Amino acid sequence: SLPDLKIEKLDEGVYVHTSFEEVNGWGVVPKHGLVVLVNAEAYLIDTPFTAKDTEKLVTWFVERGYKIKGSISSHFHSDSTGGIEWLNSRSIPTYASELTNELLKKDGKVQATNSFSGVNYWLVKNKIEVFYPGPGHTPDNVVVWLPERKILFGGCFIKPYGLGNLGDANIEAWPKSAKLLKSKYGKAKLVVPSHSEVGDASLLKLTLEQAVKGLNESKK
Ligand SMILES: O=C(O)[C@@H](Cc1ccccc1)[C@H](Cc1ccc2c(c1)OCO2)C(=O)O
Ligand SMILES: [Zn+2]
Ligand SMILES: [Zn+2]
Ligand SMILES: [Zn+2]
């Protein structure tokens, strides 16, 4: 009895997909990803938690006729990578940074078929940019920017009311990383967090506040 996959339009050619999963002791957690349409080409930004929701998601666009050209995962946790296996079984290219691929293999999980590195990677020139702001939520977390719509996909890095799961976090790097991201993408119109709804650049500033706060708090 878990909630159904949501598919909602956010902007022209940009959809938010919402999937739900019970997570440890935190109850049912919503997780936001995007599907970015580049004409007839569809790109998943993070997979749903599960293979089933990934199939549902893909079949929903395949059914309306688009070509799934690829998937990019913003960090190694299964709320970003849960459907990589299923995609791979269907010949859909999957992408992750080399670091993200190293952590997947280290946890006994299937890896993306295509890796990248460098602070900046373009999945699609002048359309989908992949950016590494430095450790935060995880050592490997990256963000995805959509220049043509001014939409920034923040992932589990963006945490405007509390940092969430610190199990793999780097509290000491987060403020710096938060500040850089803040500077770089200060002018996004929309900011899409993994576990909060879409807001504006204010969430960049709140994330920075939480990391700073989170930091002192663990110092005492
Ligand atoms: O670490 C994560 O990505 C989420 C938990 C998780 C871990 C491993 C596989 C799937 C899911 C976690 C979800 C979460 C958990 C607790 C939170 C929260 C968000 O915001 C406030 O409190 C997060 O992103 O921080
Ligand atoms: Zn995570
Ligand atoms: Zn998360
Ligand atoms: Zn939502």
Question: What's the CA angle centered on 191, arms 171 and 181, to 5 degrees?
Answer: 45
Q: Are 153 and 144 in contact (CB under 8 A)?
A: yes
Q: Is 21 left (phi over 0), alpha (psi -120 to 50) or beta?
A: beta
Q: Residues lining ligand 1, judged by CB closer than 6 Å?
A: 23, 26, 29, 77-79, 156, 162, 164-165, 194-195
Residues 6+ apart with CB under 8 A from 124: 38, 41, 43
Structure tokens, 171: 């509290």
- Which letter does DSSP use for residue 75 in this model? S
Which of 61, 59, 142 lies closest to 100, judged by CA? 142
- In the beta sheet, which residues pair with residue 33? 17
Kindly list the domain boundaries of the chain, sorted by start residue: 1-220
Give the method of determination.
X-ray
**Sheet arrangement for strand 114-116:** 6-11, 14-22, 28-38, 41-45, 67-72, 94-97, 114-116
CA atoms within 13 A on the CB side of 133: 33
d(CA 139, CA 99): 8
Ligand 1: nearest atom to the Cα of 168:
1
Paired sense of beta strands 94-97 and 67-72, if any: parallel
Report the 3 state secondary structure along 52-63: HHHHHHHHHHHH
Ligand 1: nearest atom to the Cα of 31:
13
Paired sense of beta strands 41-45 and 28-38, if any: antiparallel
Q: 97 — phi, psi (to 5°)?
A: -70, 165
Residue 196 CA, ligand 1 centroid: distance in Å: 11
Q: Which CATH architecture has domain 1-220?
A: 4-Layer Sandwich (3.60)
Place of tokens 């990248």: 116
